[PDB]
Amino acid sequence: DVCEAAGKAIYIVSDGTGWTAEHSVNAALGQFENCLADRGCAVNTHLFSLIDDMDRLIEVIKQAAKEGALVLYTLADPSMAEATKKACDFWGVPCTDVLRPTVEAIASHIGVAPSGIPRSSPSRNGRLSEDYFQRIDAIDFTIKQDDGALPQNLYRADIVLAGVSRTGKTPLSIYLAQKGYKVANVPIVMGVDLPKSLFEINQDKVFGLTINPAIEMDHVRQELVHANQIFAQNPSWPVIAVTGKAIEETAAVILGILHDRKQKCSMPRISKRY
Amino acid sequence: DVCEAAGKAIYIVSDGTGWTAEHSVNAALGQFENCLADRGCAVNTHLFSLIDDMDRLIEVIKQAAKEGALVLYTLADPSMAEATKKACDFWGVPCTDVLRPTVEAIASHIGVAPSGIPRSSPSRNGRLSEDYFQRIDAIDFTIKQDDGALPQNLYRADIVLAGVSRTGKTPLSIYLAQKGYKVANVPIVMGVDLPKSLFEINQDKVFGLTINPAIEMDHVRQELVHANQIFAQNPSWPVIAVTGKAIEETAAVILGILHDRKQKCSMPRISKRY
Ligand SMILES: Nc1ncnc2c1ncn2[C@@H]1O[C@H](COP(=O)(O)O)[C@@H](O)[C@H]1O
Ligand SMILES: Nc1ncnc2c1ncn2[C@@H]1O[C@H](COP(=O)(O)O)[C@@H](O)[C@H]1O
Ligand SMILES: [Mg+2]
Numbered sequence: 001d002v003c004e005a006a007g008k009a010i011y012i013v014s015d016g017t018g019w020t021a022e023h024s025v026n027a028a029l030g031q032f033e034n035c036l037a038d039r040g041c042a043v044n045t046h047l048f049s050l051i052d053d054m055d056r057l058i059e060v061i062k063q064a065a066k067e068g069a070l071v072l073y074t075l076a077d078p079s080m081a082e083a084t085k086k087a088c089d090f091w092g093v094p095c096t097d098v099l100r101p102t103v104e105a106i107a108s109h110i111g112v113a114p115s116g117i118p119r120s121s122p123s124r125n126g127r128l129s130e131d132y133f134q135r136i137d138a139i140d141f142t143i144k145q146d147d148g149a150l151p152q153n154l155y156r157a158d159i160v161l162a163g164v165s166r167t168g169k170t171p172l173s174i175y176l177a178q179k180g181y182k183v184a185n186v187p188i189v190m191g192v193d194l195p196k197s198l199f200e201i202n203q204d205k206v207f208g209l210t211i212n213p214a215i216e217m218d219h220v221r222q223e224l225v226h227a228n229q230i231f232a233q234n235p236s237w238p239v240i241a242v243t244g245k246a247i248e249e250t251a252a253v254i255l256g257i258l259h260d261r262k263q264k265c266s267m268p269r270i271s272k273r274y
Numbered sequence: 275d276v277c278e279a280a281g282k283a284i285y286i287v288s289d290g291t292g293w294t295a296e297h298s299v300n301a302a303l304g305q306f307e308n309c310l311a312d313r314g315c316a317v318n319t320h321l322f323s324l325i326d327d328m329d330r331l332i333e334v335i336k337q338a339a340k341e342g343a344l345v346l347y348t349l350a351d352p353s354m355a356e357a358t359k360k361a362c363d364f365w366g367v368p369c370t371d372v373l374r375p376t377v378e379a380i381a382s383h384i385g386v387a388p389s390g391i392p393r394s395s396p397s398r399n400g401r402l403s404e405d406y407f408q409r410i411d412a413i414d415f416t417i418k419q420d421d422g423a424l425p426q427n428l429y430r431a432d433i434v435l436a437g438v439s440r441t442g443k444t445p446l447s448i449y450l451a452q453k454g455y456k457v458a459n460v461p462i463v464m465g466v467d468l469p470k471s472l473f474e475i476n477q478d479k480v481f482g483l484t485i486n487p488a489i490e491m492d493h494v495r496q497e498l499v500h501a502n503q504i505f506a507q508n509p510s511w512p513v514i515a516v517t518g519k520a521i522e523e524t525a526a527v528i529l530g531i532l533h534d535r536k537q538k539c540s541m542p543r544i545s546k547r548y
């Protein structure tokens with residue numbers, strides 16, 4: 001009577017949350033879209049957060065071996081990394097440290113040795129940045145948002161999404177809010193007037209969103225027509241075709257454009273100070 | 275008259291969005307918490323999305339060299355990766371491919387060669403998964419949430435956060451919603467009764483959240499006392515101390531516990547089928 005044979009397995013193992021790795025794995029898996037599409041292959045990801053000591057580490061790998069699984073991992077303490085590869089070797093199981101390469105490149109380039117301490121440990125912790133606390137007020141602003149008090153928000157908002165219902169306004173607005181931006185959504189509906197404040201605010205920062213209907217319900221054709229006229233009336237608004245694109249993709253388009261305008265450069269790019 | 279000398283620079287460069295890399299960089303930077311704390315060092319991240327051709331690639335590195343900056347990158351096409359390292363060598367600039375290691379480990383372990391095609395290109399695209407469309411309904415459920423229609427939601431919700439105001443309920447609920455979980459928030463206030471449906475729903479899935487006040491306003495002491503009594507009355511609820519912890523940390527705690535119960539195992543872990 002058990003829960004864990006079926007498919008090729010992958011262990012994601014971190015002394016912290018496991019998310020950085022899960023992200024990298026998620027992206028990596030993209031290279032086998034077509035494999036996974038038709039179940040040509042199939043994968044199981046198993047995520048082990050908070051692996052901050054030796055005993056617990058050794059058990060995971062033991063298990064990984066028992067299950068027959070690749071171990072992708074992230075461990076701040078160098079000894080733990082050594083141990084992981086040694087114990088992977090000893091149990092005869094494939095492995096790979098997904099971000100020491102990245103940690104070390106940064107370490108030489110900055111010219112400082114890594115602390116070797118995870119986020120988990122008692123030292124330096126509770127040290128949440130100003131970047132983080134900004135993203136909270138963004139998140140707050142963006143969800144705490146009725147259409148009753150829209151005008152005022154359009155002035156405050158860093159980004160303004162404008163588009164018909166079936167564009168991804170809510171997820172996207174939330175995604176951008178997490179990145180640090182106060183976002184305001186303005187739906188385009190046949191037969192309701194847009195707030196005049198939409199056009200009085202800074203017109204850089206309004207972004208049109210649109211669906212390609214090519215992917216009865218030709219009312220949607222009607223709406224998309226009406227929408228494009230609004231967008232014509234407003235040439236300076238970028239108009240992003242949104243269907244079959246991930247939020248995170250669209251978000252990058254918007255942010256590239258936003259940052260390119262917000263700071264005019266030789267080479268256009270999204271920049272952050274640390 | 276220009277925008278881009280000050281601090282050590284880092285270029286994040288992807289044929290797609292740049293996010294996977296930015297994530298890995300963000301995490302990596304953790305190893306130099308104390309360096310960056312006192313401005314012992316200081317860093318600039320520059321994010322270049324959609325670098326899907328040679329000319330544009332070569333310009334970025336040229337710029338990177340001009341700026342004197344490390345290039346961390348993600349490129350599906352092998353030629354582009356070669357080109358990147360060669361041109362980095364030619365301009366004499368440090369670099370490192372942050373996820374081919376991970377792509378290749380997966381490729382041997384699964385026993386299939388990577389497609390070498392980015393998300394950007396015309397082939398296979400618009401192929402958004404069922405995992406993704408689930409996360410949308412989650413996101414929808416979690417924000418589209420008044421306290422008027424709370425009971426009903428507690429039954430539907432996959433996770434239920436219960437805690438006083440100053441716990442991170444809204445950000446966290448949103449973060450979890452993006453991961454796939456319908457979340458319901460229940461605030462604990464002195465002098466308002468909790469919905470009786472809180473106690474009639476599956477009691478695995480309620481998670482208490484609490485602030486350590488150690489980090490006039492001893493009303494907060496009053497609230498935290500009252501809260502803990504509710505939590506005492508309900509022993510099966512985990513009670514996560516939340517202050518000075520990131521959302522993503524807390525989220526992992528909750529999800530570990532959730533998954534551990536949801537599927538009882540020898541080794542506790544968060545699992546996903548692909
Ligand atoms: N602020 C931080 N301080 C120290 N290490 C960190 C920090 N943020 C992320 N990390 C490390 O980066 C890796 C990323 O994994 P995770 O945090 O689980 O997504 C782990 O080994 C963490 O310990
Ligand atoms: N579904 C996918 N198909 C192909 N490549 C992907 C997919 N998802 C992510 N990637 C690749 O993974 C890397 C991650 O970068 P990013 O997508 O910008 O965060 C890029 O080189 C992308 O092209
Ligand atoms: Mg991780």
Ligand SMILES: [Mg+2]
Nearest residue numbers: 292293294295
């Ligand atoms: Mg990337």
